[PDB]
Design an enzyme around this catalytic site. Structure first.
Site, PDB file in Angstrom:
ATOM      1  N   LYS B 219       0.778  -1.205   0.000  1.00 53.50           N
ATOM      2  CA  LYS B 219       0.000   0.000   0.000  1.00 53.50           C
ATOM      3  C   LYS B 219       0.825   1.277   0.000  1.00 53.50           C
ATOM      4  CE  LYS B 219      -4.521  -1.034   0.315  1.00 53.50           C
ATOM      5  NZ  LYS B 219      -4.755   0.280  -0.372  1.00 53.50           N
ATOM      6  N   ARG B 253      -3.459 -10.343   4.893  1.00 51.77           N
ATOM      7  CA  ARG B 253      -3.795 -10.433   3.486  1.00 51.77           C
ATOM      8  C   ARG B 253      -2.656  -9.912   2.708  1.00 51.77           C
ATOM      9  NH1 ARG B 253      -5.890  -7.020  -0.338  1.00 51.77           N
ATOM     10  NH2 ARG B 253      -7.303  -7.978  -1.834  1.00 51.77           N
TER      11      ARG B 253
END
Lengths: 273, 273
Positions: B219, B253
């Site tokens: 991210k 995840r």
């Protein structure tokens, strides 16, 4: 957090800005020489430059007598090897140098040849004069936890007691608080399960009031958990670096400076260092 | 720790043994087709097999409408793409499958085609019927924190309040506590500094009494801290995975199953999971 900086001759290390990265330099000895050869010294210098370019703040230099080899070697031999390395690296790489030795005379020669920090895997217990060396030259000393056995009553309480015994040796020799660093000696004198127990409870070392260096890089206990050989322990080393920073470590001692320096910097940002 | 297992049709996930690894599978759409093509489905299946071989416990499957692309696409289109993928992967890869959607009809078709877990980046707030879907089929649903703004009063208190509002939607629809999983939605609706603040305070989510999945892989905020592009965020992702496990996350995840699965397993061993 820390109300002083670590003073290191022309260098200064801030303990509040960031987790400090100590890059490991093990000597590759030339056969045919006792030290100072071109191939051997130039390989050291090239390696120290790479570690600098990748984010190292200190270069840790080790001769044959120390980890990972533990070669039985005379101090006079160990000095022919380490001194040339320290001279060349200190001139060519602008970073403080720690000398990885438990021998007082090896420490004293390394500092004279340019080393700034003593790193003692025996915590001044194998040769108490190393603390007198540290005191005279007024340099930081890292006292690592170690013993010649694993008969522990209570792993962590005994580690703290044993580290105290090092602090007392150092202080009795003239070593100022500001020049004491501690290290839990992960991978020394501990079963795999004890190394993990010490990682899990590392924050307890902080009650002694000194900066803590964590040195777990590529150690056996990582292999024990992941069942992977020494060259596939990057991720496992990373986990220990992260858990260490979270639990308050001011330094990490690592082989893989590029990767662990990015992990450290992410952790610093998350924990607010 | 947890007094139930997560039930997933023929699979069962223990929440106490180990941090559960959720591998991310994003569809690579074929041009010229709306879905079910050989190249597109076979690439999905090969990828899910690699993630299985590397240590994934769940395979998370996402169409075009969800992250990272957010393509405006009709449900009828999204189903032509995702259903073939779910059918092939579930037959060929023996692991539970989560469907990454906020759309109730996409969830309902995915489950019928073999999906075991709903993963909703809007926490049943974009389409509350998704919780009714979850309730009927009796499957786990992951409710992620999200909002359409970053006007926060107090980041963490507001996250917990917002996640509660998801829990209430789920419970009002018939969703049993044991089928609720929460996710802090790192990288959603937060400034870089808020994403770091949420990482630093993640353990607060645990007071809600549900398992927590952390999803930080590659991210933007990692790039913001390290100033590195998406393909050089492995170490930064690793740091977040480690800090997450330390703070009690039951799932992560991730894109890089091999590496993060070794990091997770080292962390588990250290914290005593």
């Amino acid at each position: 957090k820390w109300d002083y900086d670590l003073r290191c001759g022309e260098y200064t290390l801030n303990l509040n800005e960031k987790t400090l990265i100590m890059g490991i330099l093990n000597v590759t000895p030339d056969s045919f020489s006792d030290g100072g050869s071109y191939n051997e010294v130039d390989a050291a210098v090239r390696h120290a430059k790479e570690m600098r370019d990748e984010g190292a703040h200190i270069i840790d230099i080790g001769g044959e007598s120390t980890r990972p080899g533990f070669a039985k070697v005379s101090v006079e031999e160990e000095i022919k090897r380490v001194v040339p390395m320290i001279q060349a690296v200190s001139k060519e790489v602008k970073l403080p140098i720690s000398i990885d030795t438990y021998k007082a005379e090896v420490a004293k020669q390394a500092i004279e040849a340019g080393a700034h920090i003593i790193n003692d895997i025996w915590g001044a217990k194998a040769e108490p004069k190393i603390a007198e060396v540290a005191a005279h030259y007024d340099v930081p000393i890292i006292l690592m936890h170690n013993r010649d056995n694993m008969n522990y009553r209570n792993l962590m309480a005994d580690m703290i007691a044993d580290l105290y015994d090092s602090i007392k040796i150092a202080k009795d020799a003239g070593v100022r608080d500001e020049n004491i660093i501690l290290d839990p000696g992960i991978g020394f004198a501990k079963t795999p399960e004890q190394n993990l127990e010490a990682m899990r409870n590392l924050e307890q070392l902080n009650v002694l009031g000194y900066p803590v260096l964590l040195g777990t890089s590529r150690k056996s206990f990582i292999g024990h958990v992941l069942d992977l050989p020494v060259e596939e322990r990057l991720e496992g080393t990373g986990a220990t670096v992260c858990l260490g920073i979270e639990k308050g470590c001011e330094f990490v001692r690592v082989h893989d400076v590029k990767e662990m320096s990015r992990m450290a910097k992410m952790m610093d940002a998350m924990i607010g260092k």
